[PDB]
RNA sequence: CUGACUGGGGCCUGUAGAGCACUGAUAGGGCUAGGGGGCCCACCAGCCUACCAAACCCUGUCAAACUCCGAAGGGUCCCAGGUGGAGCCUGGGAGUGAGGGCGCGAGCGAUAACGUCCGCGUCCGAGCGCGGGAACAACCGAGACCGCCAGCUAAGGCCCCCAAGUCUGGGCUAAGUGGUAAAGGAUGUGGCGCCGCGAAGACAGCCAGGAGGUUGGCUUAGAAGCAGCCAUCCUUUAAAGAGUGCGUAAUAGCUCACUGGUCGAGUGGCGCCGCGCCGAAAAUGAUCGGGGCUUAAGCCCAGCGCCGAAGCUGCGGGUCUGGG
RNA sequence: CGCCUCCUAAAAGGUAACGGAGGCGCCCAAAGGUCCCCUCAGGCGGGACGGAAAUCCGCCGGAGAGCGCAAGGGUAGAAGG
RNA sequence: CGAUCAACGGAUAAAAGUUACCCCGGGGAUAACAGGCUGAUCUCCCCCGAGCGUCCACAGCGGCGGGGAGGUUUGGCACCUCGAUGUCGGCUCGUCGCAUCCUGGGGCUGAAGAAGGUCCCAAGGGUUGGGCUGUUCGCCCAUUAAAGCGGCACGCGAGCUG
RNA sequence: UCCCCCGUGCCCAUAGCGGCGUGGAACCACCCGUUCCCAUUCCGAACACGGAAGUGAAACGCGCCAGCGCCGAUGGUACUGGGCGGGCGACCGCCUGGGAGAGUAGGUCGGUGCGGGGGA
């Protein structure tokens, strides 16, 4: 008697890293995610692993455009 | 259920908006050819130019080029220089190419 | 018949207090009004067991009105099997969707043979004038063998009452009875171990 | 007796038995019903024993409706092994049953017959039960 | 107006944040009374440790 | 002044619950490919099926690794309260890196363990200091600087051991239940509710009547209401089932059901609630902590009063810290 | 016994057990960049060989297909062809 | 560029076994005995009433299921004890429980009688000698009213045996 | 400032599917051609050019209809932050604050910005 199971992988610490209204700087990571759960919006880049980040210094804003998906914006200051 | 046309159109427009320029959008009907230079931040048109509105003549291509120059003129007069070319569902060719070259001669920046 | 029931208005009385006092919370509404009401449970229950959602209830309000209503929905307390809230639907002169009782007239052939009539629909949904509410709707089931069945299509409707459900909707059936002779072969019958849906490079 | 023909998973964590039945609370097919008064995992064998007794009461006749189904696998470690070394093996299947559920209904049989059958069936179940008969409340759900 | 708050049941055995609330209210000893401005932040802590406290409206 | 905690506001989330739209499970029914089987055939198509049954549909459900939904909460940021043995920064010194009980949420285990493994919280650890809990680290109460032959309380208590009520009003319990247990059983008791039947005289008793077809059969070998199911029809009735059981080898043999005379007021059955009864067997001598308690000294409801700690107060003192 | 994916995990992050299930130790010179174009599975109907399924035509079909490999997230307004 | 340094933060460039001949330091942080908690397993008792018993559920029985009690079994757990809680069987000496083996009392019986079965009350007393085996147990011989089953650290090694 | 149409956005189905109707002056489409630019793994179907005889048949635009789809109260309940009780347990309740999902009533055959072209 013994187990064929027993493994699991490290947690990846995914999810939003800066919420709406929060002041960010150019480069700040805003969202960490698998695929496009949030899409890059105004002043927001997407890295190869879908990571969303601020393109300019400013304030984070979220936007839910229905069938168009959810969006992270950064509004300049 | 979209069409190859509806898709093509989205696909190019989406790329153009992403860059944040004023967009020179082009409509090409069987007879005429129109041009809005649009600000998508504001959802607004800033300058127009049509073969319909210019009561312009004959050879469609030559006509296009004319609306092209026409657009640029009203455009620079409003301070607009740079802009992005929205070929819509249209291959950049023919009448559209012609319109594009015209706004170019006209001094539009793209 | 057509049944009558005293009703009363409630504002902020707590539904639990009401219930603790023998009163059943409820609401009456239609497109024009929506009022929070309660009834005496034991009175309501007396009516409702005959009424059901099938027959008209008239609500004798304290303001003096007397509104004709259908019970539209009854919430049961799932642990205790008791009503806990009623929806009274205020009939007005438009036609209404509703449930009209089926009567299964006659003894099916299948039942003589030892079978069992499964009264699958004991009522039927119907758009109809309030002024036109049938007491019931007869259905001849006497031609039913095990294992035949009737559908709403086979229903012969009264005047001014239109079907509100698919004609293809089965409404009664006659099925084989329970039999002790089946037990031994059921009790002996080898059943296979459950298959586990393959995960991974298996599928 | 009753068991899933197939499952996505072989073993299920145990869970809890809090609350009244989620649904299954009103009579919905036959004439008389057997409702659970207290929660339990009802075993497939217990279900089948309840059923068989009822058909036995009826001899020939009636319809029995079974409204609970054992899709929960019950696990147990082999005798005398110690703790650890993996989860037990499936030994049977239970149907989770919280208070209020109509577990069985009967139809097509006299009242004294539906009464007695459900009583005897009740004695096979490891919980307290009440026999109900179809009301308007059932019909209105 | 003002809130007169009195600590009357011991915070011993209650979660740290209720102890923290008493600290925000400045309540340190049983039976101690504190008169506090009746503002919404203060009222939040009074309501938080309501089962430990006796409140009375004053002036 | 930035802290814990709190107020307001934005954003993030996929749990409880629920749902079945997805993935799967699922009872029954409908509809209907596909098989099985029976008619009818090999000239290849038919037809019938109370058989197993796909997809689909309806009713009704199930799921940690399902979700069309989806809270309470939680997290974070902004503004504000918040001066605390708060917070932040640099540095010096550690010890710890065997935890444990309890509550809640899970997993494992057997819906076992004073079990095990995580999460949130608490307490013991280090509060084996104090009151209650008979006794008892972690349950309730409460954070012991010192002193007092002062006061008020907390949990818990107020018949005696034992401080304070043999306190007040309403109710139940007759089991010493209280003062350890389940399925299940029961004319225990009190209280509600719903049915039947009855002065067109019911129930009990003192009296009758219970009857033709017909010892009916799909019925073997007896099967005459009373060995299985797919029959309950009537004649005659004031009434009487092709019958409740006791009866036979099958009968015959009696009563009920059901109508009639006597009395003359209720009677029979179901269900629910409260408190009790049985179910209840273990090993040195018993026992609710003891004595002892029965309109309680038990239980439920509603009161007033007191007792009660190292908690709080009064009085005096010490030390540290802050402020004068 | 390292690494990945899901669950457990109590709706931020994290979270154990010899708890429940699966994968990795490669690969691709295109399976990479960019421009341009295209859109699926499946269902019904029609069509020689040709069948449940080869290719063709019609209608319906928002994504259930695809995306080298496990799972998950993502995704046709493309990441698919 | 050379790592299945995969025991995957990788001790050396380089490494398996045995000890009942054994030793030291430690641990009741951790097994084996006993106790404890638990009661799955075990023993006993009920609920249900299919069915058996010519007839007849319940004389005697009780399908499939269901609820419990006990704490003698086998285990689970790892809580005192590893600066020691001596461990099976026997002998000796008892003492207790009662789910009673006998004797006393009783109900039912498919109890004519005699003899039985089954349940109930009952723990006062009694409960044999021998062959086998270390055995407990068990089988066997010869008897008996009977040849009971358990607890007491699987009662009892500062009481003996070994 | 109102009506129609052509572009382009925003809300993200109350905007969709289906049935019916309607429009060609203008605009848009289909349309006529395939010399020319450009193009088909074949096809002027598409993309593309040059055109202006025809037709709103297709498409599109605008109306109407609630069969499907989508939206959806109020009421009550589940669940729950915090605070309390009960049960030997599985589990069950009270207080305060929050409060679904299903369902019922009901709603929907879109609303709106910018610029053009035409009309009153
Ligand atoms: Mg293994
Ligand atoms: Mg694992
Ligand atoms: Mg990790
Ligand atoms: Mg981990
Ligand atoms: Mg993970
Ligand atoms: Mg996130
Ligand atoms: Mg990149
Ligand atoms: Mg990439
Ligand atoms: Mg916003
Ligand atoms: Mg913005
Ligand atoms: Mg578990
Ligand atoms: Mg079980
Ligand atoms: Mg298990
Ligand atoms: Mg285990
Ligand atoms: Mg197991
Ligand atoms: Mg089992
Ligand atoms: Mg249930
Ligand atoms: Mg039972
Ligand atoms: Mg429902
Ligand atoms: Mg306290
Ligand atoms: Mg406390
Ligand atoms: Mg708290
Ligand atoms: Mg104090
Ligand atoms: Mg304190
Ligand atoms: Mg401050
Ligand atoms: Mg801060
Ligand atoms: Mg803060
Ligand atoms: Mg806050
Ligand atoms: Mg759930
Ligand atoms: Mg489903
Ligand atoms: Mg549905
Ligand atoms: Mg569940
Ligand atoms: Mg989950
Ligand atoms: Mg879930
Ligand atoms: Mg918060
Ligand atoms: Mg917030
Ligand atoms: Mg501040
Ligand atoms: Mg300071
Ligand atoms: Mg400190
Ligand atoms: Mg500190
Ligand atoms: Mg330091
Ligand atoms: Mg030092
Ligand atoms: Mg250290
Ligand atoms: Mg250390
Ligand atoms: Mg360590
Ligand atoms: Mg430890
Ligand atoms: Mg721990
Ligand atoms: Mg700790
Ligand atoms: Mg540990
Ligand atoms: Mg814990
Ligand atoms: Mg509790
Ligand atoms: Mg727990
Ligand atoms: Mg878990
Ligand atoms: Mg158990
Ligand atoms: Mg303890
Ligand atoms: Mg523990
Ligand atoms: Mg525990
Ligand atoms: Mg546990
Ligand atoms: Mg702890
Ligand atoms: Mg220590
Ligand atoms: Mg303490
Ligand atoms: Mg402490
Ligand atoms: Mg203590
Ligand atoms: Mg002490
Ligand atoms: Mg001490
Ligand atoms: Mg103490
Ligand atoms: Mg004490
Ligand atoms: Mg004491
Ligand atoms: Mg003095
Ligand atoms: Mg006092
Ligand atoms: Mg008190
Ligand atoms: Mg006392
Ligand atoms: Mg004494
Ligand atoms: Mg005294
Ligand atoms: Mg008194
Ligand atoms: Mg007694
Ligand atoms: Mg007593
Ligand atoms: Mg007693
Ligand atoms: Mg009784
Ligand atoms: Mg009673
Ligand atoms: Mg006779
Ligand atoms: Mg008893
Ligand atoms: Mg009294
Ligand atoms: Mg005192
Ligand atoms: Mg003090
Ligand atoms: Mg002094
Ligand atoms: Mg002083
Ligand atoms: Mg590795
Ligand atoms: Mg997680
Ligand atoms: Mg998760
Ligand atoms: Mg998480
Ligand atoms: Mg969480
Ligand atoms: Mg972090
Ligand atoms: Mg592997
Ligand atoms: Mg290529
Ligand atoms: Mg690629
Ligand atoms: Mg390429
Ligand atoms: Mg196809
Ligand atoms: Mg085909
Ligand atoms: Mg062919
Ligand atoms: Mg084909
Ligand atoms: Mg896919
Ligand atoms: Mg693979
Ligand atoms: Mg090397
Ligand atoms: Mg290593
Ligand atoms: Mg190594
Ligand atoms: Mg390592
Ligand atoms: Mg090395
Ligand atoms: Mg080397
Ligand atoms: Mg080595
Ligand atoms: Mg050895
Ligand atoms: Mg040796
Ligand atoms: Mg030797
Ligand atoms: Mg030697
Ligand atoms: Mg030697
Ligand atoms: Mg030696
Ligand atoms: Mg040694
Ligand atoms: Mg050493
Ligand atoms: Mg130990
Ligand atoms: Mg250790
Ligand atoms: Mg040990
Ligand atoms: Mg040991
Ligand atoms: Mg042991
Ligand atoms: Mg010991
Ligand atoms: Mg036990
Ligand atoms: Mg028993
Ligand atoms: Mg027999
Ligand atoms: Mg008999
Ligand atoms: Mg029998
Ligand atoms: Mg018996
Ligand atoms: Mg058995
Ligand atoms: Mg059991
Ligand atoms: Mg047992
Ligand atoms: Mg036990
Ligand atoms: Mg023991
Ligand atoms: Mg023992
Ligand atoms: Mg015990
Ligand atoms: Mg053990
Ligand atoms: Mg043991
Ligand atoms: Mg130990
Ligand atoms: Mg441990
Ligand atoms: Mg030792
Ligand atoms: Mg010693
Ligand atoms: Mg020693
Ligand atoms: Mg000793
Ligand atoms: Mg020895
Ligand atoms: Mg003895
Ligand atoms: Mg006895
Ligand atoms: Mg005797
Ligand atoms: Mg005799
Ligand atoms: Mg005899
Ligand atoms: Mg006897
Ligand atoms: Mg004796
Ligand atoms: Mg004795
Ligand atoms: Mg004896
Ligand atoms: Mg000899
Ligand atoms: Mg011998
Ligand atoms: Mg022997
Ligand atoms: Mg032996
Ligand atoms: Mg004898
Ligand atoms: Mg002997
Ligand atoms: Mg032992
Ligand atoms: Mg011994
Ligand atoms: Mg012994
Ligand atoms: Mg000994
Ligand atoms: Mg010795
Ligand atoms: Mg010995
Ligand atoms: Mg000794
Ligand atoms: Mg000794
Ligand atoms: Mg000794
Ligand atoms: Mg001796
Ligand atoms: Mg438009
Ligand atoms: Mg528009
Ligand atoms: Mg706009
Ligand atoms: Mg027309
Ligand atoms: Mg149209
Ligand atoms: Mg025209
Ligand atoms: Mg015309
Ligand atoms: Mg032309
Ligand atoms: Mg050519
Ligand atoms: Mg040319
Ligand atoms: Mg063409
Ligand atoms: Mg048309
Ligand atoms: Mg078009
Ligand atoms: Mg309308
Ligand atoms: Mg809804
Ligand atoms: Mg609501
Ligand atoms: Mg609440
Ligand atoms: Mg709570
Ligand atoms: Mg509320
Ligand atoms: Mg919800
Ligand atoms: Mg809702
Ligand atoms: Mg619509
Ligand atoms: Mg406009
Ligand atoms: Mg205009």
From Swiss-Prot, chain A:
GO annotation (BP), single: translation
PROSITE patterns, per the entry: RIBOSOMAL_L27 (PS00831)
Family: Belongs to the bacterial ribosomal protein bL27 family.
Keyword match Hydrolase: no
Binding partners and assembly: Part of the 50S ribosomal subunit.
Transmembrane parts of this sequence: none
Coiled coil: none
Alphabetized HAMAP family for the sequence: Ribosomal_bL27
Annotated spans, Disordered: 1-14
Cellular-component GO terms for this entry: cytosolic large ribosomal subunit
Keywords: Ribonucleoprotein, Ribosomal protein
Domain of life: Bacteria
Pfam family, one: Ribosomal_L27
Keyword Ribonucleoprotein part of the UniProt annotation: yes
Protein name: Large ribosomal subunit protein bL27
NCBIfam families membership: L27 (TIGR00062)
GO terms of molecular function: structural constituent of ribosome
Known role: Found on the solvent side of the large subunit.
SUPFAM superfamilies linked to this entry: Ribosomal L27 protein-like
Signal peptide: none
Gene3D superfamilies named in the record: 2.40.50.100
From Swiss-Prot, chain B:
GO MF term list: 5S rRNA binding; structural constituent of ribosome
GO biological process: translation
Entry-linked Gene3D superfamilies: 3.30.420.100
GO cellular component, as recorded: cytosolic large ribosomal subunit
InterPro entries, per database record: Ribosomal_uL18_bac-type, Ribosomal_uL18_bac/euk
NCBIfam families hit by this protein: L18_bact (TIGR00060)
Name of the protein this chain belongs to: Large ribosomal subunit protein uL18
Organism: Thermus thermophilus (strain ATCC 27634 / DSM 579 / HB8)
High-level lineage: Bacteria, Thermotogati, Deinococcota, Deinococci, Thermales
Gene expressing this chain: rplR
UniProtKB/Swiss-Prot annotation, chain D:
InterPro entries, per the entry: Ribosomal_uL16 (IPR047873), Ribosomal_uL16_bact-type (IPR000114), Ribosomal_uL16_dom (IPR016180), Ribosomal_uL16_sf (IPR036920)
Example GO molecular function: structural constituent of ribosome
Any one of the GO CC terms: cytosolic large ribosomal subunit
Record keywords: Ribonucleoprotein, Ribosomal protein, RNA-binding, rRNA-binding, tRNA-binding
A Pfam short name: Ribosomal_L16
SUPFAM superfamilies xrefs: Ribosomal protein L16p/L10e (SSF54686)
An example Gene Ontology biological process: translation
Record's keyword annotation contains GTP-binding: no
CDD domains: Ribosomal_L16_L10e
Family under the similarity heading: Belongs to the universal ribosomal protein uL16 family.
Function: This protein binds directly to 23S rRNA. Interacts with the A site tRNA.
Subunit structure as annotated in this protein's UniProt entry: Part of the 50S ribosomal subunit.
Record protein name field: Large ribosomal subunit protein uL16
Organism: Thermus thermophilus (strain ATCC 27634 / DSM 579 / HB8)
Swiss-Prot record, chain E:
HAMAP family for the chain: Ribosomal_uL30_B (MF_01371_B)
Family membership noted in the UniProt record: Belongs to the universal ribosomal protein uL30 family.
InterPro entries assigned to the protein according to its UniProt record, in alphabetical order: Ribo_uL30_ferredoxin-like_sf, Ribosomal_uL30_bac-type, Ribosomal_uL30_CS, Ribosomal_uL30_ferredoxin-like
Assembly mode: Part of the 50S ribosomal subunit.
This protein's encoding gene: rpmD
Keyword terms of this UniProt record: Ribonucleoprotein, Ribosomal protein
GO molecular function, one term: structural constituent of ribosome
Domain of life: Bacteria
Name used for this protein in its record: Large ribosomal subunit protein uL30
UniProt organism field: Thermus thermophilus (strain ATCC 27634 / DSM 579 / HB8)
Key word Coiled coil present: no
GO cellular component: cytosolic large ribosomal subunit
């Amino acid at each position: 008697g013994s187990t064929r199971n027993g493994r699991d992988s490290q947690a990846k610490r995914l999810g939003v890293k800066r919420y709406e209204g929060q002041v960010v700087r150019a480069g700040n990571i805003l969202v960490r995610q698998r695929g496009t759960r949030f899409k890059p919006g105004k002043n927001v880049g997407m890295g190869r692993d879908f990571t969303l980040f601020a393109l300019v210094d400013g304030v984070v804003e979220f936007q839910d455009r229905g069938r168009l998906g959810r969006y992270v914006h950064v509004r300049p200051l | 259920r979209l069409t190859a046309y509806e898709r093509r159109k989205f696909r190019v427009r989406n790329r153009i908006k992403r860059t944040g320029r004023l967009r020179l959008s082009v409509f090409r009907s069987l007879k005429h050819i129109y041009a809005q230079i649009i600000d998508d931040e504001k959802g607004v048109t800033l300058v127009s130019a049509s073969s319909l509105a210019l009561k312009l003549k004959g050879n469609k291509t030559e006509v296009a080029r004319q609306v092209g120059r026409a657009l640029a003129e009203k455009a620079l007069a409003l301070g607009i220089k740079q802009v992005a070319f929205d070929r819509g569902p249209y291959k950049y060719h023919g009448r559209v190419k012609a319109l594009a070259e015209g706004a170019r001669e006209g001094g539009l920046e793209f | 018949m057509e049944y009558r029931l005293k009703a009363y208005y409630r504002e902020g009385e707590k539904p639990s207090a009401l219930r603790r006092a023998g009163k059943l919370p409820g609401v009456m509404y239609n497109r024009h009004l929506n009022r929070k009401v309660y009834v005496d449970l034991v009175e309501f229950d007396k009516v409702f067991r005959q009424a059901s959602i099938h027959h008209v209830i008239v609500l004798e309000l304290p303001d003096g009105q007397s509104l004709p209503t259908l019970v539209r929905q009854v919430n049961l307390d799932k642990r205790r099997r008791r009503p806990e809230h009623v929806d009274f639907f205020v009939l007005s002169d438009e036609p209404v969707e509703m449930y009209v009782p089926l009567r299964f007239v006659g003894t099916p052939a299948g039942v003589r043979a030892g079978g069992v009539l499964q009264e699958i629909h004991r009522d039927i949904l119907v758009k109809v004038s309030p002024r036109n509410i049938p007491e019931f709707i007869e259905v001849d089931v006497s031609g039913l063998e095990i294992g035949d069945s009737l559908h709403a299509s086979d229903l012969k409707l009264p005047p001014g009452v239109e079907l509100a459900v698919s004609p293809e909707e089965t409404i009664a059936a006659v099925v084989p009875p329970e039999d002790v002779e089946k037990l031994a072969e059921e009790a002996a019958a080898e059943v296979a171990e459950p298959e586990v849906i393959k995960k991974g490079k298996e599928e | 007796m009753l068991m899933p023909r197939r499952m996505k998973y072989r073993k299920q964590q145990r869970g809890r038995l809090k609350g009244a039945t989620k649904g299954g609370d009103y009579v919905a097919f036959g004439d008389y019903g057997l409702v659970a008064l207290e929660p339990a995992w009802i075993t497939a064998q217990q279900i089948e024993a309840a059923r068989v007794a009822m058909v036995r009461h009826f001899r020939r006749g009636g319809k029995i409706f079974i409204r609970i189904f054992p899709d929960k696998p019950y696990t147990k470690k082999p005798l005398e092994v110690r703790m650890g070394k993996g989860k037990g093996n499936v030994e049977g299947y239970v149907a989770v049953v919280k208070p209020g559920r109509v577990m069985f209904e009967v139809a097509g049989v006299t009242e004294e017959q539906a009464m007695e059958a459900l009583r005897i069936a009740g004695h096979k179940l490891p919980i307290k039960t009440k026999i109900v008969r179809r009301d308007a409340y059932d019909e209105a759900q | 107006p003002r809130l007169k708050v009195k600590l009357v049941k011991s915070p011993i055995g209650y979660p740290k944040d209720q102890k923290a609330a008493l600290k925000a209210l400045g309540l340190r000893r049983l039976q101690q009374e504190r008169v506090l401005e009746d503002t919404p932040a203060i009222r939040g802590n009074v309501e938080k440790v309501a089962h430990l406290v006796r409140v009375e409206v004053v002036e």
